[PDB]
Amino acid sequence: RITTLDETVGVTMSHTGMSMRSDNSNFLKVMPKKEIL
């Protein structure tokens, strides 16, 4: 069955939106004229 996370919610909800934690995983990061003559 589906497992229910029992934590204080505020931790998971902090990990949802902005949490001041970016990156941590690499994915979809992607003259002389005579001599020249």
- Smallest distance, another protein to C-beta of residue 37, A: 36
Q: Which is nearer to another protein, 5 or 36 (CB)?
A: 5
Tracing tokens 């001041």 back to the chain, one arrives at 20
- Smallest distance, another protein to C-beta of residue 31, A: 31
Contact between 5 and 12 under an 8 Å Cβ cutoff? The reply is yes
Backbone angles phi, psi at 5, to 5 degrees: -70, 125
Q: Is 7 in the site for another protein (CB under 8 A)?
A: yes
The end-to-end CA distance of the chain, in Å, is: 75
Residues of this chain that interact with another protein (CB under 8 A) are 4-5, 7-14, 16-22, 25-30
